[PDB]
Amino acid sequence: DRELAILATAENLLEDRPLADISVDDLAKGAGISRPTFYFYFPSKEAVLLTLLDRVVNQADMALQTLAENDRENMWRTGINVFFETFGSHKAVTRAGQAARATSVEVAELWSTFMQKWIAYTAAVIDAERDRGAAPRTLPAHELATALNLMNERTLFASFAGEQPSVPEARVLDTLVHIWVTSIYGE
Amino acid sequence: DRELAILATAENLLEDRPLADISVDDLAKGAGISRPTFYFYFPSKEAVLLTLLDRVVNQADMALQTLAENDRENMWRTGINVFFETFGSHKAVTRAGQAARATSVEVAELWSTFMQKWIAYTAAVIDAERDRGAAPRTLPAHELATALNLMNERTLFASFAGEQPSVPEARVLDTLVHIWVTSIYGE
Ligand SMILES: CS(=O)(=O)NCC#Cc1ccc(S(=O)(=O)NCCC(F)(F)F)cc1
Ligand SMILES: CS(=O)(=O)NCC#Cc1ccc(S(=O)(=O)NCCC(F)(F)F)cc1
Numbered sequence: 001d002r003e004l005a006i007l008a009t010a011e012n013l014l015e016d017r018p019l020a021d022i023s024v025d026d027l028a029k030g031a032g033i034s035r036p037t038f039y040f041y042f043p044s045k046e047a048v049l050l051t052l053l054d055r056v057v058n059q060a061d062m063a064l065q066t067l068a069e070n071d072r073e074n075m076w077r078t079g080i081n082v083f084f085e086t087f088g089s090h091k092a093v094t095r096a097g098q099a100a101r102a103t104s105v106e107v108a109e110l111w112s113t114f115m116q117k118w119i120a121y122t123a124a125v126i127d128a129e130r131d132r133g134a135a136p137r138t139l140p141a142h143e144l145a146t147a148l149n150l151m152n153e154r155t156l157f158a159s160f161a162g163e164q165p166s167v168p169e170a171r172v173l174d175t176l177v178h179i180w181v182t183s184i185y186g187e
Numbered sequence: 188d189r190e191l192a193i194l195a196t197a198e199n200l201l202e203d204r205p206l207a208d209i210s211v212d213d214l215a216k217g218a219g220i221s222r223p224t225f226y227f228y229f230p231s232k233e234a235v236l237l238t239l240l241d242r243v244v245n246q247a248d249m250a251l252q253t254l255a256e257n258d259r260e261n262m263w264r265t266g267i268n269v270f271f272e273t274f275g276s277h278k279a280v281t282r283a284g285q286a287a288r289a290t291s292v293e294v295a296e297l298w299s300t301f302m303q304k305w306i307a308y309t310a311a312v313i314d315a316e317r318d319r320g321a322a323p324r325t326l327p328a329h330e331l332a333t334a335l336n337l338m339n340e341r342t343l344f345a346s347f348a349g350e351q352p353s354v355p356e357a358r359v360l361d362t363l364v365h366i367w368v369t370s371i372y373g374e
Contacts, residue, residue, distance in 0.1 A: 099289055102286055102289055112350075112351050112352065115352050116351065116352050119352050138365060139361065139362060139365050140358070143354050143355075143358050143362050144362065144365070144366075146342075146352050146353065146354050146362075147338060147342050147354055147359075147362045147363065147366055148366070149352070150338065150341040150342045150345055150352075150353075150354075151334060151337065151338035151341065151342070151366075153341060154337040154338065154340060154341035155333075155334050155337045155338070158337055163299075164299050164303065165299065165302050165303050165306050165333050165336070165337075166333065166337075167330050167333050167334055167337075168330075171327070171330050172334075174326065175326060175330050175331065175333075175334045176334065178325060178326050178331070178370065179331075179334055179335070179338075179366060179370040182369040182370045182373030183365065183366040183369045183370055183373075185373075186369030186370075186372075186373040
């Protein structure tokens with residue numbers, strides 16, 4: 001309500017500048033509320049970012065669950081694309097959220113909890129592919145899954161932030177899908 | 188001299204706690220010098236970390252140049268192993284150096300300059316492998332190289348920091364080499 005206005009303001013301001021350069025007064029002003037009214041909904045601007053990141057992570061997780069409840073190259077591409085579109089639609093929050101992992105235990109723990117879930121699901125799909133005889137028994141599935149998820153984390157976030165170096169955003173899906181399919185199916 | 192003692196002290200203290208929890212007075216005391224004598228060799232504790240990271244990055248780069256001036260799976264493993272051993276021998280500096288990328292333009296630019304070099308060298312070796320007919324012309328070599336280097340950055344540093352999630356350090360070389368060889372040679 002006022003909560004949503006605060007969150008919408010924070011997402012808008014993060015498009016232009018870092019959390020460090022955004023005051024509680026900036027978020028209050030943008031949301032049309034006082035400073036003490038702000039503090040009724042959120043203990044800090046840090047908790048605003050935690051809630052924004054929580055919503056974006058849950059949106060991606062819910063989109064991947066929808067896919068899971070329904071060719072091998074297209075199967076992986078469709079799944080990687082959940083993360084590309086979801087985080088790529090929320091670049092300001094992605095970026096600020098990754099930077100807050102260093103300073104926020106709640107942000108580090110949110111990101112860690114979802115990465116463990118996404119890795120466990122990746123490993124379960126590789127195992128299914130091995131069980132049906134489509135993928136060879138090479139590396140431990142859980143270790144392969146970990147490295148691939150870490151690759152995607154670093155490569156997606158570098159591309160969205162326009163880091164040097166980065167894969168251009170228009171090439172990153174093809175790039176990741178190639179490495180996933182060759183490393184999962186390759187003998 | 189006193190410079191080396193300051194650097195050795197900083198590396199020792201970073202084994203126990205973050206830069207934020209290390210004072211110029213801590214580095215001076217450890218190096219057996221006064222606070223103003225410290226400031227003669229370094230403008231700040233941040234510049235000490237920049238110099239430590241500079242030395243570790245150059246050690247890895249010089250080891251990779253030595254290799255370059257001399258089976259396909261073993262060739263990539265030997266090269267990845269430069270980074271595994273070099274950064275893995277300097278875990279405190281690696282960790283503090285990666286955290287300083289967020290706050291230090293000099294640290295962000297050092298890391299970016301060497302990543303561009305290492306990616307350009309990776310791409311040149313893939314191209315050579317394609318030219319000799321050992322590797323298929325799949326992805327653009329420079330884009331494949333970028334994602335693989337980013338994977339290694341994230342996966343090595345997660346393992347060395349014992350992050351959750353991470354590939355166990357005793358499995359990370361096998362894990363990365365498998366993804367490199369299948370993605371470089373796989374059709
Ligand atoms: C259509 S399907 O059945 O759902 N395909 C199977 C799948 C899947 C799957 C895809 C991508 C990733 S990840 O590595 O991209 N996510 C980590 C967060 C990051 F994006 F930060 F990496 C993880 C799992
Ligand atoms: C024996 S040889 O001829 O030298 N083999 C060819 C090679 C190579 C080569 C290996 C590993 C990497 S990287 O991706 O590990 N480094 C990025 C820094 C990071 F470690 F942070 F990633 C880059 C290039």
